[PDB]
């Protein structure tokens, strides 16, 4: 046996867009949110859009980054959904184009089995304005889904992907069940199931 379910981080497991929250601390939230929206709608190349948004955070003090991170709250039904999923024999993972500093926290908190995300480069207690990681390429999340499944010896037909943006496309491509959670048109068009109510528990009826 064994099943696997992956979630994107921003706006799915948590209620906010990490990059937008941090940008708010840098006084550049209007340009960043506009770019985030375009990126998730699939109107921009993900990597380029992320490097462009992170560049605007150059020199931001880590204390500032932390204030933004502290504002990150879990999406309604998050804890309950994860608990029931583990109950049904699922390996639970979070794969995000976001940042480890924020994602690892929810991994710790919710007790997730796997967490993959990019990294904000920091030096002298301040962001350098650069980002690196393996969740940048268009095919990134899909390779990660496959890699986690291979490690676990889980068949792709037994994998579930829950996303909300353009960069979740490659994840859907390899997932057995594709669920778009309060997502952008570009991803909804590719989903087996579209959920419009902001409650992660809404996915459970379709799970297992």
């Amino acid at each position: 046996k064994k099943k696997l379910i992956l979630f994107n981080f921003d706006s799915t497991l948590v209620n906010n867009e990490t990059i937008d929250e941090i940008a708010r601390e840098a006084g550049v939230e209007e340009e960043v949110k506009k770019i985030t929206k375009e990126a998730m709608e699939g109107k921009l190349n993900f990597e380029q859009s992320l490097r462009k948004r992170v560049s605007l955070l150059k020199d931001l003090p880590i204390e500032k980054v932390e204030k933004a991170i502290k504002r990150i709250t879990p999406t309604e039904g998050a804890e309950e959904t994860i608990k029931e999923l583990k109950n049904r024999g699922y390996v639970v993972a979070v794969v995000s184009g976001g940042f480890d500093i924020a994602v690892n926290k929810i991994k710790e908190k919710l007790g997730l089995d796997y967490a993959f995300a990019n990294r904000l480069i920091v030096k002298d207690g301040k962001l350098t304005g650069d980002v690196e990681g393996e969740v940048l390429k268009e095919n990134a999340k899909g390779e990660i889904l496959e890699k986690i499944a291979k490690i676990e010896g889980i068949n792709l037909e037994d994998t579930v992907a829950v996303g909300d943006g353009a960069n979740d496309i490659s994840m859907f491509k390899k997932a057995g069940l594709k669920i778009a959670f309060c997502a952008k048109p570009i991803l909804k068009e590719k989903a087996d199931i579209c959920i419009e109510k902001r409650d992660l528990r809404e996915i459970l009826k379709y799970i297992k």
Side-chain angles (χ1 to χ4, degrees):
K1 253 299 177 181
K2 270 301 183 183
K3 294 170 291 186
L4 165 68
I5 183 173
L6 296 75
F7 295 97
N8 63 280
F9 182 70
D10 302 302
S11 294
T12 292
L13 283 186
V14 298
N15 291 303
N16 335 68
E17 287 296 320
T18 305
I19 182 59
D20 289 350
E21 288 288 347
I22 297 178
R24 184 173 156 72
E25 286 288 316
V28 302
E29 189 191 63
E30 79 157 39
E31 168 171 26
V32 173
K33 178 165 62 176
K34 183 172 182 291
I35 299 173
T36 293
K37 186 186 182 67
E38 295 174 1
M40 292 303 90
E41 286 166 355
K43 304 186 180 186
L44 296 177
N45 172 266
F46 188 73
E47 189 176 334
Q48 295 193 322
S49 80
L50 186 66
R51 291 192 182 287
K52 183 172 181 168
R53 287 172 285 168
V54 171
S55 181
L56 290 161
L57 309 175
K58 188 179 183 307
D59 297 319
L60 194 68
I62 282 296
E63 186 182 359
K64 291 284 191 174
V65 176
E66 287 308 324
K67 288 177 176 58
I69 292 180
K70 262 171 293 182
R71 295 201 295 281
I72 297 178
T73 66
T75 290
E76 174 187 351
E79 324 199 318
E80 313 79 287
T81 302
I82 300 304
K83 176 191 171 62
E84 177 53 19
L85 284 165
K86 294 181 172 182
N87 184 41
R88 303 188 186 181
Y90 275 87
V91 167
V92 179
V94 60
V95 182
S96 174
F99 315 115
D100 287 318
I101 186 178
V103 182
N104 194 256
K105 297 201 65 182
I106 306 307
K107 174 202 172 186
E108 294 299 318
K109 177 70 179 176
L110 298 180
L112 274 46
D113 300 300
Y114 290 90
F116 284 90
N118 297 311
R119 304 178 292 288
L120 290 170
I121 302 305
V122 189
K123 187 187 183 61
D124 192 50
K126 297 164 295 185
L127 302 183
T128 68
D130 182 48
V131 59
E132 301 299 345
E134 310 304 303
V135 201
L136 297 172
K137 296 180 182 177
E138 184 291 318
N139 59 38
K141 298 201 184 184
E143 306 196 339
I144 293 177
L145 182 157
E146 284 201 300
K147 284 17 285 170
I148 295 176
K150 184 62 178 180
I151 290 177
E152 297 288 318
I154 296 177
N155 192 300
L156 295 181
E157 311 313 293
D158 299 311
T159 60
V160 186
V162 184
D164 70 349
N167 69 323
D168 294 313
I169 293 295
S170 69
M171 185 164 69
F172 267 27
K173 195 160 297 179
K174 336 215 76 169
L177 189 57
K178 324 178 198 307
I179 301 177
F181 181 75
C182 302
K184 295 296 183 185
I186 193 175
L187 186 69
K188 302 214 298 176
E189 193 286 313
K190 295 294 187 172
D192 293 314
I193 298 173
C194 291
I195 292 179
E196 300 309 317
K197 182 180 178 297
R198 288 195 66 71
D199 193 327
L200 282 183
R201 288 172 302 197
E202 294 289 341
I203 71 172
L204 297 173
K205 63 171 72 69
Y206 293 112
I207 301 304
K208 197 212 71 165

